[PDB]
Structures are given as C-alpha cells and as structure tokens.
Amino acid sequence: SLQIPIKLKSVLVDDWEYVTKDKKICRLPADVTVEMVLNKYEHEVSQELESPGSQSQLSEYCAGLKLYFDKCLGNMLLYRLERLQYDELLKKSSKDQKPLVPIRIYGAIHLLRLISVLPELISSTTMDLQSCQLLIKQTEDFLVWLLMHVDEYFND
Amino acid sequence: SLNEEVTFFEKAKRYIGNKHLYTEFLKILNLY
Amino acid sequence: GKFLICYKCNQTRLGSWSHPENSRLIMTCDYCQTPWHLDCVPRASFKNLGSKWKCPLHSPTKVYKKIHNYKVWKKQRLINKKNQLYYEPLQKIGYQNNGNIQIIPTTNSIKYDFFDKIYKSKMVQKRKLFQFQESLIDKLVS
Amino acid sequence: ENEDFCSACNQSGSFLCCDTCPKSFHFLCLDPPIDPNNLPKGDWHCNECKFKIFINNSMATLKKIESNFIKQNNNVKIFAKLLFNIDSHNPKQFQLPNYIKETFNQDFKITQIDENSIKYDFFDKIYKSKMVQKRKLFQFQESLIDKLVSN
Ligand SMILES: [Zn+2]
Ligand SMILES: [Zn+2]
Ligand SMILES: [Zn+2]
Ligand SMILES: [Zn+2]
C-alpha cells in the first residue's frame, strides 16, 4: 500500500539506468552507510516522538531494518556487477578476521531499494493486518523523513 | 522520580503476591 | 493447615473463643480462592447459594463505558481446545486486541531497555512543555 | 533436471544443476558467490532443498522451530517473520516492483500478550491521555486569552 512521491521514483530509476545501461556501481565503502541514516533518524524522530511506547516501536523498527538489511542484501538487494563486488567484500572480510556486515558497508540507497521491494515481499507470506499497518506507517514516516533531506544522501 | 516510575510494576507484582491476581491485574491494565 | 489471610487487611481475625466478637468472618473467592473478610469487601451474606461469588480482584467480563450513548464490551466465551486458536502477536506495542488476551511468561537487557525508554520520552515531553510556554508569553506582548 | 535460463539472474550461462528442483544458478547467483572449480563436493542441495530436508517436510516441527526462532529475537520481533522467509528464499536478481517501474475459528482468536507489552501499552496510553488533556487545556487557555484581548 506504499504511495511514494515522484522524487524517490526518479532517483530509483536513475540508479536503475546507472546500474543496467551503465557499468558504474556504487563506491566501495558506499560513503554514508545506513548506519548513519538509521542512527540519526532515530536521534531526530525519538526527540520528536512523545510516548515511550512509540519510541520502543521506533528502536524496534530501526534494529529490525538493520538486521533485515544484513540478512537480505545477499538475497534480493543485488544487481549485475555487484555480485563480484560482494564476493570481493567477503574475501576481504576473512582476511582481517572480522565477520562480514552489510549495514556498515552498502549505501543508504540499497536501503531504499529494500523499502521498494518491501510491499510485494511482505504480502507473500501470512502476515497480520495491524502489524502490516504498523510496518507501512513506519515505512511512510521514514520515507518522509528521508524526503526532508534527500539531497544529503542522493546527490551525484 | 524516574526510579519509582521504572520500579512501580515489579514492586506492584511483589505486593500482589499470587501470580493469578497479578495476571488479572495485568488484564485490568490491558483493558484500560 | 495454614491461616487464610484476608487480602485487604493482611490479617486473619480468628478470635479467641473467650472474645468471639473479635473474630471477623472470612470467605474465599469461588474462582481464585482468594480469602476476603466480610468487612474488607462490604458484604453481609456469605453467598451460600445462587451465583458464585467473585472477589474484587478479578477482571470483568462485561463493562460499560461512556461515549461522551455508550459502548459495551463482553469477553469472549471459553472455547474447547479443538476450536480455540491462541495466536501470538508480532506487534508488541499498540496491538489492538479485543480485550481478550492471554498472559505468557516473560523471558536483563529488557529491564534497562525500559529505563532508557522512559528517560528519552520524558525528556522529549519536557521539551514539548518548554516549546509552548515561550509562545504563550510572547503572545502577551503583542 | 536443468533449466535453459538462470532462474535467479534471467540470462543463460554456466549453471549448477540441482537434484530435486530443475532450476539452476550461476556461480555468483547464490547467497554465496560459489567459487568456480572450487565447489564443495556433494549432492549440491540448494537453499530450497536444504530447507525441505531440514524440516523433513512436516508442518509441526517447522512451526515449532519458527516459533522458537521468533522467541530468540524479540528485539527485531516485527521483522522476525520476515527473517524466516529469507531462509527459504533462493536469491535472485532484483526485478523491479511494478509500481516502481511506472515513473470461523479465526474470529475468537485469543491474543497471546506479555507483561512487558502490557506495561508499554499502559504507559503509552496514559501519557497520550495526560498530554492530550494538558495540551487541549493549554489551547483553550490561549483561545480564552485571545478572546479577552480582542474583546
Ligand atoms: Zn480483611
Ligand atoms: Zn477471588
Ligand atoms: Zn544467474
Ligand atoms: Zn534445489
């Protein structure tokens, strides 16, 4: 039930053009990670949010989105000329003995890709009504918080 | 001020005693 | 063999058979067996026949609330195990249950999670208090 | 026993024929980028095949380990159901969503709730009620002040 505005659609289709019709992919450290986005997003919304209950849902949604990004980037959030990049990342991670982690690697734009695939992905299996509404509500206010400063993370 | 706010629930549970009465107390607090 | 301690007064007034007027009558609830004095809950009868006596600690199965007409809520009747489905919410906070719920056991991090969640929220509230009173005194000058 | 096209990336190339499902994958179209000429020796169970023989194609044990998995991670609880489908998901190329391409025993279900959720809900709703009555009192006070100033 997502109705995202035209600017997210435009930046997503221009990323599609850069990833399909062009060989160019995102930078290695992908600059600002979703770490940053979710972190500050919490630091602004929780100071705008009023109830302790709503802040519990905010932190819960942040942690779940981070873990889902980590556990689903290798499953859907990849394109051509990025599987080799992911292979290079996982061979580099085993060199310094630290375990691999997608959250602090990929850019906030693959997070927006996860939000884009989320409506079709959620309705595939058995899921609630009210939990679904909570998820799209957190989706929509996270998206409008992105819409406040798209130019911070989506400028070429 | 903060400490009593976070400590109210389990001190209420300690004052309740029986776990069935605390279950009905949580049912009351949910119905509210 | 222990003493039925009344819930409200936290005492059992057994009496002494030399001063039997010092003995307070005690009954037990017909559902949770919680013993109550006849004076702590205002009652004169012992509820010997008719309906089962319910102590004040039990949650109601029927309540009326004011609309400000009215609205009524009745708890769902018990259903046998072959046709009764108990389901666990995925949403923890704000799940609109019909008032018909079941309590599951709670299984150190959660304890401190509650502590910071009140801190932050109350902080935000102070800020919400401080953002509106300044607009009030800045309205009086105009 | 094999597929002419890769069911993940949707072009033809070097394939790995699975045993049960006829779908085949490229050497990178897998959760892990299986190194060509270095593929582990065995039957080559895929993620779907490993999900079926992990649960032994019976519903009761799969729901019980799904509930056990959700019980483990209550911090990511709303996404916990969505973490499970991933295990039973064969990684594929990101095909765009369609809108992105453009420009009765269930009625009397008893809710299984916990003490901490009741605590959070009670605190949330009392804070909501207290500050909506406080803010409406403040708004009525401001409106009455404006009415007395204008009069
Ligand atoms: Zn008494
Ligand atoms: Zn009773
Ligand atoms: Zn492929
Ligand atoms: Zn297979």
Side-chain angles (χ1 to χ4, degrees), chain B residues 15-32:
Chain B
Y15 177 87
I16 285 317
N18 173 18
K19 84 205 153 191
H20 312 67
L21 311 178
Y22 189 59
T23 286
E24 303 266 353
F25 178 69
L26 293 174
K27 283 183 169 186
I28 288 289
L29 285 186
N30 168 60
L31 270 182
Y32 174 69

Side-chain angles (χ1 to χ4, degrees), chain C residues 12-66:
Chain C
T12 181
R13 322 268 293 274
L14 177 89
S16 56
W17 175 237
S18 36
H19 304 326
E21 73 272 0
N22 296 17
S23 95
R24 297 291 169 271
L25 305 139
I26 188 159
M27 76 217 273
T28 44
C29 184
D30 298 336
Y31 304 94
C32 55
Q33 273 71 37
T34 300
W36 279 86
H37 274 134
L38 267 278
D39 308 355
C40 293
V41 46
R43 273 195 61 89
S45 59
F46 257 100
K47 210 51 182 300
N48 302 129
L49 67 181
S51 77
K52 268 154 83 158
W53 178 66
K54 207 154 205 186
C55 88
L57 310 175
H58 309 242
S59 175
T61 59
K62 166 138 57 182
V63 78
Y64 303 86
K65 72 173 311 303
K66 234 163 180 183

Side-chain angles (χ1 to χ4, degrees), chain A residues 42-43 46-57 59-60 127-128 130-131 134, chain C residues 87 89-97 113 116-118 120-122 124-125 127-128:
Chain A
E42 179 140 49
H43 187 279
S46 63
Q47 279 78 331
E48 288 287 90
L49 264 183
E50 293 177 350
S51 285
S54 301
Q55 296 177 191
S56 304
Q57 323 194 50
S59 175
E60 212 284 338
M127 189 85 167
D128 289 345
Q130 321 212 63
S131 90
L134 178 53
Chain C
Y87 155 92
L90 231 57
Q91 168 179 9
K92 306 153 70 214
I93 329 289
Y95 191 87
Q96 316 211 2
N97 50 62
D113 183 314
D116 315 298
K117 218 65 54 193
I118 308 314
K120 298 172 50 58
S121 48
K122 295 199 300 184
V124 176
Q125 304 334 306
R127 179 214 72 147
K128 189 54 73 152

Side-chain angles (χ1 to χ4, degrees), chain A residues 18-34:
Chain A
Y18 307 167
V19 77
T20 45
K21 313 296 179 53
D22 194 2
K23 178 259 169 185
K24 174 180 56 180
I25 73 164
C26 328
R27 286 179 168 88
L28 313 182
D31 289 345
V32 167
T33 59
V34 298

Side-chain angles (χ1 to χ4, degrees), chain A residues 118-146:
Chain A
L118 223 41
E120 175 253 294
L121 152 63
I122 280 187
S123 191
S124 55
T125 80
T126 77
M127 189 85 167
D128 289 345
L129 313 101
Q130 321 212 63
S131 90
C132 264
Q133 308 277 17
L134 178 53
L135 273 188
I136 40 184
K137 190 212 73 53
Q138 288 300 119
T139 303
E140 289 272 8
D141 55 23
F142 180 68
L143 287 157
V144 306
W145 185 89
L146 285 180

Side-chain angles (χ1 to χ4, degrees), chain A residues 1-5 8 38 41 45 57-58 61-62 65 68 111-122 127 130-147, chain D residues 78-79 82 99-100:
Chain A
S1 172
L2 255 75
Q3 321 277 96
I4 66 187
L8 314 172
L38 300 191
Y41 162 75
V45 166
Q57 323 194 50
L58 179 63
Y61 183 76
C62 282
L65 202 53
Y68 199 76
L111 169 58
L112 200 290
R113 189 182 258 91
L114 179 57
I115 326 292
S116 68
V117 55
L118 223 41
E120 175 253 294
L121 152 63
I122 280 187
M127 189 85 167
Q130 321 212 63
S131 90
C132 264
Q133 308 277 17
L134 178 53
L135 273 188
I136 40 184
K137 190 212 73 53
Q138 288 300 119
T139 303
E140 289 272 8
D141 55 23
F142 180 68
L143 287 157
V144 306
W145 185 89
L146 285 180
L147 291 163
Chain D
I78 188 90
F79 282 98
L82 218 57
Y99 72 107
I100 299 293

